[PDB]
Amino acid sequence: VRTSVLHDALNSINNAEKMGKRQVMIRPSSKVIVKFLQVMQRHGYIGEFEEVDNHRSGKIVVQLNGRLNKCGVISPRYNVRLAELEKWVTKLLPARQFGYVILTTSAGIMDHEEARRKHVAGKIIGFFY
């Protein structure tokens, strides 16, 4: 059964982009999904997205503009200290100059670079580059 709505959204986005399409549809919509898209949007990796409102859960239609290589999710949301955050960027990021690792903390979800500025840590939920 559906055990991770976030994985379904990120997987569906990756498939359409890899095939060269321009738009995607996501069947279930949640707060974590929208907060994940907003982080990607502010860095220019996607465009506008719109949330149609059926009374059950709503859908999302995202607009693609290339520039996106992969967007994945880590299924067991591990606990990561602030001191060991550099282990992860060495693992699942192509290079040190660019790329973002998404965390969830008590101060909202944010990428791995803003968390360093605010000096906050938490749980890891995904990545995109």
* Site residues for another protein per CB under 8 A: 54-55, 75-78
Q: Do β-strands 71-73 and 59-63 pair in parallel, antiparallel, or remain unpaired? A: unpaired
68 contact, one of RNA, another protein, none, CB 5-8 Å limit per kind: none
Q: What residues have CB less than 8 Å from 53, skipping those under 6 apart? A: none
Q: Determine how many CB atoms are found less than 10 A away from the CB of residue 116.
A: 14
CA distance 96 to 38: 22
Q: Binding mask 44-83 vs RNA (x if CB under 7 A, - otherwise)?
A: -----------xxx-----------xx-xxxxxx-xxxxx
Residues that bind RNA (CB under 7 A): 1-5, 7-8, 11-12, 14-16, 18-19, 27-32, 55-57, 69-70, 72-77, 79-83, 87, 91-92, 94, 104-109, 114, 117-123
